[PDB]
Amino acid sequence: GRKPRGRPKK
DNA sequence: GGGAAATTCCTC
DNA sequence: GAGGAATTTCCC
């Protein structure tokens, strides 16, 4: 479950 | 269509 | 172990 680098979704 | 903000990943 | 750097998304 590795999530990439980015701003959370709305 | 461009600019600004948040979280996450890697190094020493 | 703690800190710095990189990438992605939303609004007007």
GROMACS .gro file of N, CA, C and O (backbone and C1' of nucleotides) in nm:
model
  206
    1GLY      N    1   0.086  -0.122   0.000
    1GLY     CA    2   0.000   0.000   0.000
    1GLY      C    3   0.088   0.125   0.000
    1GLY      O    4   0.070   0.215   0.079
    2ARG      N    5   0.184   0.131  -0.089
    2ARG     CA    6   0.274   0.251  -0.094
    2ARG      C    7   0.209   0.359  -0.182
    2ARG      O    8   0.189   0.341  -0.300
    3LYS      N    9   0.174   0.471  -0.124
    3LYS     CA   10   0.110   0.581  -0.203
    3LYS      C   11   0.219   0.678  -0.253
    3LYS      O   12   0.314   0.705  -0.183
    4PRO      N   13   0.207   0.727  -0.375
    4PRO     CA   14   0.308   0.820  -0.434
    4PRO      C   15   0.308   0.959  -0.369
    4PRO      O   16   0.235   0.985  -0.275
    5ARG      N   17   0.391   1.048  -0.418
    5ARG     CA   18   0.398   1.186  -0.359
    5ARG      C   19   0.294   1.276  -0.427
    5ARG      O   20   0.298   1.296  -0.547
    6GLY      N   21   0.201   1.330  -0.353
    6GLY     CA   22   0.099   1.419  -0.416
    6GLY      C   23   0.006   1.477  -0.308
    6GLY      O   24   0.012   1.441  -0.193
    7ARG      N   25  -0.079   1.569  -0.347
    7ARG     CA   26  -0.173   1.631  -0.248
    7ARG      C   27  -0.298   1.543  -0.236
    7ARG      O   28  -0.353   1.499  -0.335
    8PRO      N   29  -0.345   1.516  -0.115
    8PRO     CA   30  -0.467   1.432  -0.095
    8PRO      C   31  -0.581   1.470  -0.190
    8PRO      O   32  -0.589   1.582  -0.236
    9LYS      N   33  -0.669   1.378  -0.218
    9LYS     CA   34  -0.783   1.409  -0.309
    9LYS      C   35  -0.892   1.483  -0.231
    9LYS      O   36  -0.892   1.484  -0.110
   10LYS      N   37  -0.985   1.544  -0.300
   10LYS     CA   38  -1.094   1.618  -0.228
   10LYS      C   39  -1.204   1.519  -0.188
   10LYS      O   40  -1.232   1.499  -0.072
   11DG     O5'   41  -0.497   2.510  -2.147
   11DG     C5'   42  -0.427   2.614  -2.216
   11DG     C4'   43  -0.371   2.718  -2.119
   11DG     C3'   44  -0.262   2.665  -2.026
   11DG     O3'   45  -0.158   2.762  -2.013
   11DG     C1'   46  -0.453   2.736  -1.900
   12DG       P   47  -0.023   2.726  -1.932
   12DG     O5'   48  -0.037   2.812  -1.796
   12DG     C5'   49  -0.037   2.954  -1.800
   12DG     C4'   50  -0.040   3.016  -1.660
   12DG     C3'   51   0.078   2.977  -1.571
   12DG     O3'   52   0.121   3.092  -1.498
   12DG     C1'   53  -0.127   2.898  -1.475
   13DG       P   54   0.250   3.085  -1.402
   13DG     O5'   55   0.184   3.072  -1.255
   13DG     C5'   56   0.092   3.172  -1.210
   13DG     C4'   57   0.037   3.139  -1.071
   13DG     C3'   58   0.144   3.108  -0.966
   13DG     O3'   59   0.118   3.186  -0.849
   13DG     C1'   60  -0.014   2.928  -0.981
   14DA       P   61   0.219   3.182  -0.723
   14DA     O5'   62   0.145   3.082  -0.621
   14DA     C5'   63   0.012   3.110  -0.577
   14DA     C4'   64  -0.041   3.001  -0.483
   14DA     C3'   65   0.052   2.968  -0.366
   14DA     O3'   66  -0.023   2.971  -0.244
   14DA     C1'   67  -0.001   2.771  -0.489
   15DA       P   68   0.048   2.947  -0.102
   15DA     O5'   69   0.007   2.795  -0.067
   15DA     C5'   70  -0.131   2.757  -0.063
   15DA     C4'   71  -0.148   2.608  -0.035
   15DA     C3'   72  -0.070   2.557   0.087
   15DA     O3'   73  -0.160   2.490   0.176
   15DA     C1'   74  -0.022   2.425  -0.107
   16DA       P   75  -0.108   2.431   0.316
   16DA     O5'   76  -0.100   2.273   0.287
   16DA     C5'   77  -0.218   2.202   0.246
   16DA     C4'   78  -0.189   2.054   0.220
   16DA     C3'   79  -0.111   1.985   0.333
   16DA     O3'   80  -0.181   1.868   0.375
   16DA     C1'   81  -0.003   1.952   0.121
   17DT       P   82  -0.132   1.785   0.505
   17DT     O5'   83  -0.056   1.660   0.438
   17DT     C5'   84  -0.125   1.575   0.346
   17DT     C4'   85  -0.029   1.483   0.271
   17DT     C3'   86   0.052   1.388   0.360
   17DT     O3'   87   0.020   1.253   0.326
   17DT     C1'   88   0.192   1.499   0.199
   18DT       P   89   0.082   1.129   0.407
   18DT     O5'   90   0.202   1.081   0.310
   18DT     C5'   91   0.182   1.077   0.168
   18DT     C4'   92   0.315   1.070   0.094
   18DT     C3'   93   0.410   0.961   0.145
   18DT     O3'   94   0.437   0.868   0.040
   18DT     C1'   95   0.522   1.173   0.122
   19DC       P   96   0.521   0.734   0.072
   19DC     O5'   97   0.671   0.773   0.030
   19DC     C5'   98   0.706   0.792  -0.108
   19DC     C4'   99   0.852   0.832  -0.126
   19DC     C3'  100   0.953   0.728  -0.078
   19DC     O3'  101   1.044   0.698  -0.185
   19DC     C1'  102   0.995   0.941   0.025
   20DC       P  103   1.157   0.584  -0.168
   20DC     O5'  104   1.288   0.669  -0.126
   20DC     C5'  105   1.340   0.769  -0.213
   20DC     C4'  106   1.455   0.847  -0.149
   20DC     C3'  107   1.573   0.760  -0.104
   20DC     O3'  108   1.691   0.804  -0.171
   20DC     C1'  109   1.501   0.908   0.071
   21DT       P  110   1.832   0.729  -0.148
   21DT     O5'  111   1.904   0.824  -0.040
   21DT     C5'  112   1.930   0.962  -0.071
   21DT     C4'  113   1.990   1.037   0.048
   21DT     C3'  114   2.122   0.978   0.099
   21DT     O3'  115   2.224   1.078   0.090
   21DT     C1'  116   1.966   1.015   0.279
   22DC       P  117   2.379   1.040   0.117
   22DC     O5'  118   2.397   1.075   0.273
   22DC     C5'  119   2.366   1.206   0.322
   22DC     C4'  120   2.368   1.212   0.474
   22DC     C3'  121   2.500   1.165   0.538
   22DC     O3'  122   2.559   1.268   0.617
   22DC     C1'  123   2.310   1.060   0.640
   23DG     O5'  124   1.500   0.563   1.511
   23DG     C5'  125   1.537   0.610   1.641
   23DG     C4'  126   1.571   0.759   1.640
   23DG     C3'  127   1.461   0.848   1.584
   23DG     O3'  128   1.447   0.964   1.667
   23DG     C1'  129   1.654   0.849   1.440
   24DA       P  130   1.324   1.066   1.644
   24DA     O5'  131   1.387   1.178   1.547
   24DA     C5'  132   1.501   1.254   1.588
   24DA     C4'  133   1.548   1.350   1.479
   24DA     C3'  134   1.439   1.444   1.426
   24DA     O3'  135   1.493   1.576   1.416
   24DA     C1'  136   1.531   1.316   1.248
   25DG       P  137   1.401   1.699   1.366
   25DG     O5'  138   1.455   1.725   1.216
   25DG     C5'  139   1.596   1.743   1.193
   25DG     C4'  140   1.628   1.746   1.043
   25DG     C3'  141   1.546   1.847   0.963
   25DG     O3'  142   1.634   1.932   0.890
   25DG     C1'  143   1.532   1.628   0.865
   26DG       P  144   1.577   2.052   0.799
   26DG     O5'  145   1.594   1.994   0.650
   26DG     C5'  146   1.722   1.949   0.604
   26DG     C4'  147   1.715   1.888   0.464
   26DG     C3'  148   1.655   1.981   0.358
   26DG     O3'  149   1.736   1.975   0.240
   26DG     C1'  150   1.530   1.778   0.371
   27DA       P  151   1.700   2.065   0.111
   27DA     O5'  152   1.629   1.959   0.013
   27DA     C5'  153   1.699   1.841  -0.027
   27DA     C4'  154   1.614   1.752  -0.118
   27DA     C3'  155   1.559   1.823  -0.242
   27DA     O3'  156   1.580   1.741  -0.357
   27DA     C1'  157   1.381   1.729  -0.114
   28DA       P  158   1.534   1.789  -0.504
   28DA     O5'  159   1.398   1.706  -0.527
   28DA     C5'  160   1.398   1.563  -0.519
   28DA     C4'  161   1.260   1.504  -0.544
   28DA     C3'  162   1.191   1.556  -0.671
   28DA     O3'  163   1.153   1.445  -0.752
   28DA     C1'  164   1.047   1.578  -0.481
   29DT       P  165   1.081   1.468  -0.895
   29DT     O5'  166   0.925   1.452  -0.858
   29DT     C5'  167   0.877   1.332  -0.796
   29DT     C4'  168   0.728   1.340  -0.765
   29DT     C3'  169   0.640   1.381  -0.883
   29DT     O3'  170   0.546   1.277  -0.911
   29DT     C1'  171   0.586   1.507  -0.687
   30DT       P  172   0.441   1.290  -1.033
   30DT     O5'  173   0.308   1.344  -0.959
   30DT     C5'  174   0.248   1.267  -0.854
   30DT     C4'  175   0.133   1.343  -0.787
   30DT     C3'  176   0.021   1.385  -0.883
   30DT     O3'  177  -0.101   1.324  -0.842
   30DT     C1'  178   0.091   1.568  -0.744
   31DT       P  179  -0.236   1.341  -0.929
   31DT     O5'  180  -0.310   1.463  -0.855
   31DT     C5'  181  -0.345   1.452  -0.716
   31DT     C4'  182  -0.402   1.583  -0.661
   31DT     C3'  183  -0.526   1.633  -0.736
   31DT     O3'  184  -0.636   1.640  -0.644
   31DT     C1'  185  -0.362   1.807  -0.710
   32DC       P  186  -0.786   1.668  -0.697
   32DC     O5'  187  -0.803   1.826  -0.670
   32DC     C5'  188  -0.791   1.878  -0.537
   32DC     C4'  189  -0.799   2.031  -0.535
   32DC     C3'  190  -0.926   2.089  -0.597
   32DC     O3'  191  -0.991   2.173  -0.502
   32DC     C1'  192  -0.730   2.192  -0.690
   33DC       P  193  -1.134   2.240  -0.536
   33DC     O5'  194  -1.094   2.386  -0.589
   33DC     C5'  195  -1.023   2.477  -0.505
   33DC     C4'  196  -0.987   2.607  -0.577
   33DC     C3'  197  -1.107   2.681  -0.638
   33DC     O3'  198  -1.111   2.814  -0.584
   33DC     C1'  199  -0.930   2.654  -0.799
   34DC       P  200  -1.235   2.912  -0.617
   34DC     O5'  201  -1.179   2.999  -0.741
   34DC     C5'  202  -1.064   3.082  -0.724
   34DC     C4'  203  -1.015   3.141  -0.857
   34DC     C3'  204  -1.116   3.234  -0.926
   34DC     O3'  205  -1.062   3.366  -0.941
   34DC     C1'  206  -1.026   3.071  -1.078
   0.00000   0.00000   0.00000
